[PDB]
Coordinates of N, CA and C in Angstrom, one line a residue:
Chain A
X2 N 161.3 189.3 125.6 CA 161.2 188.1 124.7 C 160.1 187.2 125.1
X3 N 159.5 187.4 126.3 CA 158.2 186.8 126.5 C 157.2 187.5 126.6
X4 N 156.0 186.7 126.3 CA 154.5 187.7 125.3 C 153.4 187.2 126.5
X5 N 152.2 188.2 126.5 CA 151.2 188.5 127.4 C 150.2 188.1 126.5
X13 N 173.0 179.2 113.7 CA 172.6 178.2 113.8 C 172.0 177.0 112.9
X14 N 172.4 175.9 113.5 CA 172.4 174.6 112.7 C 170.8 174.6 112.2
X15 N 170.5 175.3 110.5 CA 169.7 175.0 110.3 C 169.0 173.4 109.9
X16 N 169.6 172.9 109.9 CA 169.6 171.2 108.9 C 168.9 170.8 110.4
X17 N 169.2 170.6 111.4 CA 168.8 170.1 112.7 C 168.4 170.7 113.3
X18 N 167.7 171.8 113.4 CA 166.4 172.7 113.8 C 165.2 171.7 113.9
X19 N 164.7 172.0 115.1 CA 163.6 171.1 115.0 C 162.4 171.0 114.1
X20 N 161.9 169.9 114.0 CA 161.1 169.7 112.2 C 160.4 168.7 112.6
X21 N 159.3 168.1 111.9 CA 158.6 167.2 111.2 C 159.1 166.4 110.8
X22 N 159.5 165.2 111.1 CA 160.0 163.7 109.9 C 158.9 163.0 110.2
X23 N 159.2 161.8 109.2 CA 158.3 160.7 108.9 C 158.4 159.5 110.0
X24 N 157.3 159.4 110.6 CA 157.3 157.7 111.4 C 156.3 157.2 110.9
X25 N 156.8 155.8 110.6 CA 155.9 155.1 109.6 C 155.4 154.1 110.3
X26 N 153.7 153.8 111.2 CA 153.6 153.2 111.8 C 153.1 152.0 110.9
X27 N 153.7 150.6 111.1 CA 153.2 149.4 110.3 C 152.2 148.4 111.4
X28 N 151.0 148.3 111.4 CA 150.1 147.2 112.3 C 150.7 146.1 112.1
X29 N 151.1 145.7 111.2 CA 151.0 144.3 110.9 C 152.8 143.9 111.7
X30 N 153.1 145.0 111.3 CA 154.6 144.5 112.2 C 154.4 145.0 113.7
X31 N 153.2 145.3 114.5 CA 152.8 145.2 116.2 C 152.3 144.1 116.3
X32 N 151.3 143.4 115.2 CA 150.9 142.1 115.9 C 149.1 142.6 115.9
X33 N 149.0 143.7 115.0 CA 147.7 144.4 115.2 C 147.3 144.4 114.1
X34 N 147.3 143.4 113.6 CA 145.9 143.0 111.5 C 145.2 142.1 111.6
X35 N 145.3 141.3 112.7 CA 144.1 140.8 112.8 C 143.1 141.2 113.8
X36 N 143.1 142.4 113.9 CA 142.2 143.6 114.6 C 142.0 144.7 113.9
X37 N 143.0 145.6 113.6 CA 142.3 146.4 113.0 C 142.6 146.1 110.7
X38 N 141.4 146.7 110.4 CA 141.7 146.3 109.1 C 142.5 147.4 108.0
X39 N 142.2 148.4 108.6 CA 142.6 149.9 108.2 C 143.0 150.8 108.6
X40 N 143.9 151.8 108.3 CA 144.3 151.4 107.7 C 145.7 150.5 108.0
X41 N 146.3 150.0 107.2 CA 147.2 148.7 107.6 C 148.9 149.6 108.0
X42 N 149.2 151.1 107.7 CA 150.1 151.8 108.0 C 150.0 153.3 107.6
X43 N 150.5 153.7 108.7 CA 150.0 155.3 108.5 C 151.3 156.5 108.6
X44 N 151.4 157.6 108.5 CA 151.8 158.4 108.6 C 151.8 159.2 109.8
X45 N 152.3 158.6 111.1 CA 152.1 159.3 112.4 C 152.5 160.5 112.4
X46 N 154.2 160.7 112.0 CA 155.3 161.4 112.3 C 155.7 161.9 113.6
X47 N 157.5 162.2 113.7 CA 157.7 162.3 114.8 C 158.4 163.9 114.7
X48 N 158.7 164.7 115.8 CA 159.2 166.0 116.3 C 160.7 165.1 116.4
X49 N 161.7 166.0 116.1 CA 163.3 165.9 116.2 C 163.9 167.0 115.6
X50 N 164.8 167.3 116.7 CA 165.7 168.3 116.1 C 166.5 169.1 117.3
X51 N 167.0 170.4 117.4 CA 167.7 170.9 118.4 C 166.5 172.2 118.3
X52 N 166.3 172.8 119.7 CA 165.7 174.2 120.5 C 167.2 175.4 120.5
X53 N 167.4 175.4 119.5 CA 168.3 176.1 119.6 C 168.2 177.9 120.3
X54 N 168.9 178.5 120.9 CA 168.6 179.8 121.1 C 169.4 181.0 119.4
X55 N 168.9 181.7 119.3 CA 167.4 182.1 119.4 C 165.8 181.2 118.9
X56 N 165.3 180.7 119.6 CA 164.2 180.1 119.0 C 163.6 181.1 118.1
X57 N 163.3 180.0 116.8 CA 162.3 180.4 115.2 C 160.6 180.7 116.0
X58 N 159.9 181.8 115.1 CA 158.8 182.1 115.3 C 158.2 180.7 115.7
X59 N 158.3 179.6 114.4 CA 157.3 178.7 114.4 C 157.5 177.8 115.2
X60 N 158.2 177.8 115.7 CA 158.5 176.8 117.3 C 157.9 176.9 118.0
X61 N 157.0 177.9 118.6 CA 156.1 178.8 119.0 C 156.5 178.0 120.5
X62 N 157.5 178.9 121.3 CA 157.6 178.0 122.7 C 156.9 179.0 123.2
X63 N 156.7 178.6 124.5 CA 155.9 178.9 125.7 C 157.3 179.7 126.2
X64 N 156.5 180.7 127.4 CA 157.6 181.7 128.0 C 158.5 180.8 129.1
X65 N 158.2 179.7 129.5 CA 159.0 179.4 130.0 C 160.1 178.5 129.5
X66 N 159.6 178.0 128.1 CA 161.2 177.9 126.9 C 161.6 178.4 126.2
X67 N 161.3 179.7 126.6 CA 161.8 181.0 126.3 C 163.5 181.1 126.9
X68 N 162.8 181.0 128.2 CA 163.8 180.8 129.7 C 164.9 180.0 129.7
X69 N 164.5 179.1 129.5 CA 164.6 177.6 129.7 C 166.0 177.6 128.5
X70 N 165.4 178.2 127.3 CA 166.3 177.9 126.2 C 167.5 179.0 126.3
X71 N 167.8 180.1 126.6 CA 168.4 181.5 127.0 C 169.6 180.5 128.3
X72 N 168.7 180.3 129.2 CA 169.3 180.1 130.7 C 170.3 178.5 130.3
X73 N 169.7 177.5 129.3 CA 170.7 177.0 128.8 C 171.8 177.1 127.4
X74 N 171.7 178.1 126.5 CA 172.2 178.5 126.0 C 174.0 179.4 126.7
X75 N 173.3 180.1 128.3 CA 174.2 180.8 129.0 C 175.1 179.8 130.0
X76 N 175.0 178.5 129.9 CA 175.5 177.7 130.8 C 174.9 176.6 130.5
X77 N 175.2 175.7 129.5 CA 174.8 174.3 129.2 C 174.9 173.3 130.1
X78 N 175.7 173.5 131.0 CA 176.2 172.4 132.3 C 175.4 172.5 133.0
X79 N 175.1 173.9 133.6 CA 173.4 173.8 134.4 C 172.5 173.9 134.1
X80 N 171.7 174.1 132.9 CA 170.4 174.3 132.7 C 170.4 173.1 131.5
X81 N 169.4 172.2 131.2 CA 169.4 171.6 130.0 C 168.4 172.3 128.9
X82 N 168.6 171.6 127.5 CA 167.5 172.8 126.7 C 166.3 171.9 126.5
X83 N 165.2 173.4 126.3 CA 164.2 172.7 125.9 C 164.0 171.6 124.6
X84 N 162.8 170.7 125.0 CA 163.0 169.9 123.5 C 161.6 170.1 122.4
X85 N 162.0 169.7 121.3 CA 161.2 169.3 120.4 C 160.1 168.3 120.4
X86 N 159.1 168.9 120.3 CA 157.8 168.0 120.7 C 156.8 168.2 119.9
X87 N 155.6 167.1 119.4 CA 154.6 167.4 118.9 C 153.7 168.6 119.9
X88 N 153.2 169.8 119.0 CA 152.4 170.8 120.0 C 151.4 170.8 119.5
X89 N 150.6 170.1 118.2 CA 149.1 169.9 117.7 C 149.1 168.3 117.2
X90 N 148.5 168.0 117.4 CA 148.4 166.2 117.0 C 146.8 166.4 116.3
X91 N 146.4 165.8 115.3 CA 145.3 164.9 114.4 C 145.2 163.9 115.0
X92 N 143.5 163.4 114.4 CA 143.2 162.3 114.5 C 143.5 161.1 113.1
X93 N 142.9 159.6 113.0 CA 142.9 159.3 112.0 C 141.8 158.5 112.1
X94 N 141.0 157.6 111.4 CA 140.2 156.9 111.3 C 140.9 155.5 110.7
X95 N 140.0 154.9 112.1 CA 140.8 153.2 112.1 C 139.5 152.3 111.9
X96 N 140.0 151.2 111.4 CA 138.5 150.1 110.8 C 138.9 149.3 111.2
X97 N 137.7 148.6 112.0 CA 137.6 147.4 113.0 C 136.1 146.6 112.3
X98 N 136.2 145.3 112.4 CA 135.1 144.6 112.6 C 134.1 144.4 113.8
X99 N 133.0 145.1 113.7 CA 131.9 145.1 114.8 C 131.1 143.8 115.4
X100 N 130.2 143.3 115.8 CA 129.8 142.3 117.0 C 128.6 141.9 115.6
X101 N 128.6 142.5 114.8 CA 127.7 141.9 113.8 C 128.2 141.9 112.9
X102 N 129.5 142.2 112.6 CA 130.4 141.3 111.8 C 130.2 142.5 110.3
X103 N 130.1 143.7 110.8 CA 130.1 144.4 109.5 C 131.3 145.6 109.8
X104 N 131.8 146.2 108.9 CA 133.3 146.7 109.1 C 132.6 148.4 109.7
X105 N 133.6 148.9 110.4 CA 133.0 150.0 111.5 C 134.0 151.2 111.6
X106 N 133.9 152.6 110.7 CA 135.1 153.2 111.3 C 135.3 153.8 112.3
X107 N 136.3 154.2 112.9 CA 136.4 154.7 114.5 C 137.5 155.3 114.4
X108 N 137.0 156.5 114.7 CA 138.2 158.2 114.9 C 139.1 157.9 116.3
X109 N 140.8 157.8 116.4 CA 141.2 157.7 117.1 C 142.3 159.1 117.2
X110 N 142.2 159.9 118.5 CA 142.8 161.3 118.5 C 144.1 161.1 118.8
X111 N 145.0 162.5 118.9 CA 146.6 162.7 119.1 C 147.1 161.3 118.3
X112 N 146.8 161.4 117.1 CA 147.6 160.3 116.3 C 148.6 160.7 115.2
X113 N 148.8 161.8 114.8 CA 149.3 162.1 113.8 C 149.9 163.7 114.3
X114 N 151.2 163.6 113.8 CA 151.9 165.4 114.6 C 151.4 166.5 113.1
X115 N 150.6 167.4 113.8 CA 150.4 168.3 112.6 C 151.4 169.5 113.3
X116 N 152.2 169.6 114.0 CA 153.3 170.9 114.3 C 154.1 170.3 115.8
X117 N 155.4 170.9 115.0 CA 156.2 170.7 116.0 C 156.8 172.1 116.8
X118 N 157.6 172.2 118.2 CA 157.8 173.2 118.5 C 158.4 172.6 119.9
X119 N 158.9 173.9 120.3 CA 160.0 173.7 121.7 C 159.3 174.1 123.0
X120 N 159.4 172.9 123.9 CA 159.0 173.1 125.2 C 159.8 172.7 126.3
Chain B
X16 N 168.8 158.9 132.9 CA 169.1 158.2 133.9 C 167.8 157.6 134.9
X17 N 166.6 158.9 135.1 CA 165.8 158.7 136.1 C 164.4 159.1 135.1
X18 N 163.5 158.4 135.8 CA 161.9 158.6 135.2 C 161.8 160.3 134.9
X19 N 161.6 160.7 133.9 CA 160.6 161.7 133.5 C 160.3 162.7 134.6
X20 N 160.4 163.9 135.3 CA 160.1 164.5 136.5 C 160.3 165.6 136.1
X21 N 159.6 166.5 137.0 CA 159.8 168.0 137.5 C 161.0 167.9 138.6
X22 N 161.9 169.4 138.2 CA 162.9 169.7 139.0 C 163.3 170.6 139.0
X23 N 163.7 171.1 140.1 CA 164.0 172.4 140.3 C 164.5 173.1 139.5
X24 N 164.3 174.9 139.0 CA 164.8 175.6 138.2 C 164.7 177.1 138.3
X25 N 165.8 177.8 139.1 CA 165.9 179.1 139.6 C 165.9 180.1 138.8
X26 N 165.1 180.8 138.4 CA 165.6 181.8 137.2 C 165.6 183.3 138.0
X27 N 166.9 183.3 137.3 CA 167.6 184.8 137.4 C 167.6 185.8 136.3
X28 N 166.9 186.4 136.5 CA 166.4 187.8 135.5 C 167.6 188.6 135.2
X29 N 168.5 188.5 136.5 CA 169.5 190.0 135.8 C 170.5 189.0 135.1
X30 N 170.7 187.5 135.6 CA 171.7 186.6 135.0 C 171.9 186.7 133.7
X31 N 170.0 186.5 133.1 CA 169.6 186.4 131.8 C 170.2 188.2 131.1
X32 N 170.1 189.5 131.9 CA 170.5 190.2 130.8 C 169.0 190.8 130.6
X33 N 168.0 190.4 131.6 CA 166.2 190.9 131.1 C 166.2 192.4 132.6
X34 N 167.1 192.3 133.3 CA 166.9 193.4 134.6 C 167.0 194.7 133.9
X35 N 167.0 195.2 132.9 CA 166.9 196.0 131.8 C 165.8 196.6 131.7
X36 N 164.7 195.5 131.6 CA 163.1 195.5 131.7 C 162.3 195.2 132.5
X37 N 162.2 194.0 132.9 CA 161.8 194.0 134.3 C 162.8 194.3 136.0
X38 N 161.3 194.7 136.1 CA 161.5 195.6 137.8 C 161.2 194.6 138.8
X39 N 160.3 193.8 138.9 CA 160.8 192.8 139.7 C 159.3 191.5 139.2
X40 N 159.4 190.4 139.6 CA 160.6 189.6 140.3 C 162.2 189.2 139.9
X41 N 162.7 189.9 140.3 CA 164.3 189.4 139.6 C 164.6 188.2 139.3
X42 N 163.7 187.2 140.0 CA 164.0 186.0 140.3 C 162.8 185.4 140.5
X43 N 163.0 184.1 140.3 CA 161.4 183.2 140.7 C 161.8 181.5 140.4
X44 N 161.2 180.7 140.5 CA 161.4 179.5 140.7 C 160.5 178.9 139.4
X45 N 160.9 178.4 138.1 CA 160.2 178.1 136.9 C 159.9 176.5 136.9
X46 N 161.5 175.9 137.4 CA 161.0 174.2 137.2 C 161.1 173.9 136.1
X47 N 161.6 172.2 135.7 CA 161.9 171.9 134.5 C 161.9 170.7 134.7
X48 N 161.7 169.9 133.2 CA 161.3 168.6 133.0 C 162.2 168.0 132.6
X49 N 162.7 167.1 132.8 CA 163.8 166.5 132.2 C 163.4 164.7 132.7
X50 N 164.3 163.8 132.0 CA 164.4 162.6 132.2 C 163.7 161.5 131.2
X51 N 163.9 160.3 131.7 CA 163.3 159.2 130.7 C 161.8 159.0 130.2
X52 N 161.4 159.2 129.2 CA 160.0 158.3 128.5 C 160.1 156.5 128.3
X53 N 160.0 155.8 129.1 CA 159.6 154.5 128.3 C 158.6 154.0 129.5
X54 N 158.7 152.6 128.5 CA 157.7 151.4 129.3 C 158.7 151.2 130.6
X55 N 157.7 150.9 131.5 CA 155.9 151.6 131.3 C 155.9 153.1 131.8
X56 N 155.2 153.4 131.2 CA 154.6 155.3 131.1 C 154.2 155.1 132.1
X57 N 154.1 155.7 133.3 CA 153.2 155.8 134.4 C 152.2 156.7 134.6
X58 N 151.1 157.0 135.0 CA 149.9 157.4 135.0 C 150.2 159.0 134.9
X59 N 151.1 159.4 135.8 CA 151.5 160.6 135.8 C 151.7 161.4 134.5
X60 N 152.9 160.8 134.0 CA 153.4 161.3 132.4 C 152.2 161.7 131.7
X61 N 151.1 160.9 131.6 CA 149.6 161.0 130.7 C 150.3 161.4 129.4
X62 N 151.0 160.2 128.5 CA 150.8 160.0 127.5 C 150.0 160.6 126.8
X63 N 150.3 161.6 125.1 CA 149.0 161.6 124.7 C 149.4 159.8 123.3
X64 N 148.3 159.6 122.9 CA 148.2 157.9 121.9 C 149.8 158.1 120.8
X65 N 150.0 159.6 120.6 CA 150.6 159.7 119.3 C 152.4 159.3 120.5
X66 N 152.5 159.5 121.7 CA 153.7 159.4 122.4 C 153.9 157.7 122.9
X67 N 152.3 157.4 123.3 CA 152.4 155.6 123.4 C 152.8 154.8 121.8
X68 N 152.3 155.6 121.3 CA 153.0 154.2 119.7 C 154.1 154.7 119.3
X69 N 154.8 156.1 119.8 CA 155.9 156.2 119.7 C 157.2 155.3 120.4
X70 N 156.3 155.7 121.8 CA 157.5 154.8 122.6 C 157.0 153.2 122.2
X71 N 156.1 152.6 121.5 CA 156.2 151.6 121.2 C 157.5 150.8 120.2
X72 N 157.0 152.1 118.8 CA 158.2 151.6 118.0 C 159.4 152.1 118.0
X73 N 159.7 153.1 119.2 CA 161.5 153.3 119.9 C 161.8 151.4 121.0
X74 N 160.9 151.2 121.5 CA 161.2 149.6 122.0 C 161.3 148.6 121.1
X75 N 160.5 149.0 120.1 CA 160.6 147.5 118.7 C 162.1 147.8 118.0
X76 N 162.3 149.1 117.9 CA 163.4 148.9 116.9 C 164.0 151.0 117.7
X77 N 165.4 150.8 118.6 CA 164.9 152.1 119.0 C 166.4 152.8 118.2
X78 N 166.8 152.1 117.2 CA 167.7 152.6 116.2 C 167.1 153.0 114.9
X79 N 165.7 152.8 114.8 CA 165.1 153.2 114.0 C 163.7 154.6 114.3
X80 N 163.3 154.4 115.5 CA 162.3 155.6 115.9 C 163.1 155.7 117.4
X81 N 163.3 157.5 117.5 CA 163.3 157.4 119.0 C 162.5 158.6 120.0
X82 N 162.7 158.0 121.0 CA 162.3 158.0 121.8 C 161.1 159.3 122.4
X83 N 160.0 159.7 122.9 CA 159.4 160.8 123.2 C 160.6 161.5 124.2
X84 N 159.4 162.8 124.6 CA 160.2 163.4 125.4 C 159.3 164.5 126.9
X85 N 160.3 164.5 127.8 CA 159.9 164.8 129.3 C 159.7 166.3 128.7
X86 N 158.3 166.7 129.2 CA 158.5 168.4 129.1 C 157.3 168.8 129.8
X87 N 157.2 170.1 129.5 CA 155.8 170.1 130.8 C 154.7 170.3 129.9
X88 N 153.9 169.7 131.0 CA 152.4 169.5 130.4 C 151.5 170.6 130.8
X89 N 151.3 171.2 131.8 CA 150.8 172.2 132.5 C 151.7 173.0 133.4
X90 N 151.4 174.6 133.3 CA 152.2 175.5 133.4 C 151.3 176.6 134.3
X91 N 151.7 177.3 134.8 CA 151.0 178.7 135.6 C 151.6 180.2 135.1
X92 N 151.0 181.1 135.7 CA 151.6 182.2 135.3 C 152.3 183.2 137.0
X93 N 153.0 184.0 136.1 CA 153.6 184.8 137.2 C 153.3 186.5 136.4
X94 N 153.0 187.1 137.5 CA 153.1 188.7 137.3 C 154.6 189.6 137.5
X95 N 154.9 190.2 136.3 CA 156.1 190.6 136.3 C 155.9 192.3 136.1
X96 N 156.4 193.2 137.3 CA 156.7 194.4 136.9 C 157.5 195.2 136.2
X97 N 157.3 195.6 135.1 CA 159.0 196.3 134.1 C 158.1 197.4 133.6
X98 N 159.5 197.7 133.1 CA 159.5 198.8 132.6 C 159.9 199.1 131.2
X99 N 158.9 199.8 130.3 CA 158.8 199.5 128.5 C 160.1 200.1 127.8
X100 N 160.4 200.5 126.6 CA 160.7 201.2 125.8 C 160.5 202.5 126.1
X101 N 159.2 203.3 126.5 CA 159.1 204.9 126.5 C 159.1 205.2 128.0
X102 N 160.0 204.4 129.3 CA 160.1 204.5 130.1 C 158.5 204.2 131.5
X103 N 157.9 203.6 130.9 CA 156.4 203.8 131.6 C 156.3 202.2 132.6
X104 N 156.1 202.4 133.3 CA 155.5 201.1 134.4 C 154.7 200.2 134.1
X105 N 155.0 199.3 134.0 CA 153.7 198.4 133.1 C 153.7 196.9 134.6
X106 N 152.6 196.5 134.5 CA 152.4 195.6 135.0 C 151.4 194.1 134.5
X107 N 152.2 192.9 134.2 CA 151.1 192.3 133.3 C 151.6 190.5 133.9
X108 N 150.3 189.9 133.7 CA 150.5 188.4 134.3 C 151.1 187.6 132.6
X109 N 152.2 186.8 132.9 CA 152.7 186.1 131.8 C 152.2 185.1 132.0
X110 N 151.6 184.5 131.6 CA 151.5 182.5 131.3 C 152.5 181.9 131.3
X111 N 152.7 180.3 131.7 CA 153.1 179.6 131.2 C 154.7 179.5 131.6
X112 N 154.9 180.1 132.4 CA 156.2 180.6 133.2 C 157.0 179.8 134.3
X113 N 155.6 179.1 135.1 CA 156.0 177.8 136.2 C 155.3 176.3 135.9
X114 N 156.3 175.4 135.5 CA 156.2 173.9 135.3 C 155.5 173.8 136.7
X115 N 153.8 173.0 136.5 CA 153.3 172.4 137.8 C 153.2 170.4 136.8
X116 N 153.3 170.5 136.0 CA 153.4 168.6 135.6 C 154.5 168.8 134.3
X117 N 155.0 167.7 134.6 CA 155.4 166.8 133.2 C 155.3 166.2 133.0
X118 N 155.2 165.5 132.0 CA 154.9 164.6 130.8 C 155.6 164.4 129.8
X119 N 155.5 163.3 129.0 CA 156.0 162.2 127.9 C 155.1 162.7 126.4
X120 N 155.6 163.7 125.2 CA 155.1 163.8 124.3 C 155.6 163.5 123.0

């Protein structure tokens, strides 16, 4: 099973809705004012789904706790590709400026 | 309970039910990540931005977003000897098999 169940709570994709203006960050940045980050949640359940695409050692990890929950814990759900987004700031000459900011946004989730 | 860390993790091949297929190592030492993400992140963890504004809005409101999570960030490989389906000796290096960091994602 290494390479060379509660569906409702399988790990997934939800929405986290980041608001600037509720960190204290609008009178810095101007754009956009809330975005669509999203977050990874859910259970690694054994047998791990193709698209979970774990690594061989939560392969292991998820088996070895599946066979004894008290000693091994399971792997978890995590962003495994992140996007960027483009944020707008006012510049030193006072004209609006956009700026690519990376690992902002989860484009897949999966078990590690 | 404790910061975010690597810890020990003994894996047993015939435990698993894999001594079927592989010939050796029956056993090997994998490691596992487990424990807390918050403030402050320590240099170690290396946040990527999308896990710092996470754990930001798990601190503003952590009944409403939670929390990142400890898992590994970099991994090595081990060479495993087994033996296939048409009975033949194969020998091949696996990835990704031994936790050397963890981290907050």
């Amino acid at each position: 099973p290494l390479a060379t169940k509660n569906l409702k709570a399988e790990c997934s994709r939800k929405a986290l809705h980041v608001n600037f203006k509720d960190m204290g960050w609008d009178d810095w940045i101007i754009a956009p004012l809330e975005y669509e980050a999203f977050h990874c949640e859910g259970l690694c359940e054994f047998p791990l789904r193709s698209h979970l695409e774990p690594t061989n050692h939560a392969v292991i990890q998820t088996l070895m706790n599946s066979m004894d929950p008290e000693s091994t814990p399971p792997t978890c759900c995590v962003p495994t590709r992140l996007s960027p987004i483009s944020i707008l700031f006012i510049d030193s000459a006072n004209n609006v400026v956009y700026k690519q900011y990376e690992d902002m946004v989860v484009e897949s989730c999966g078990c590690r």
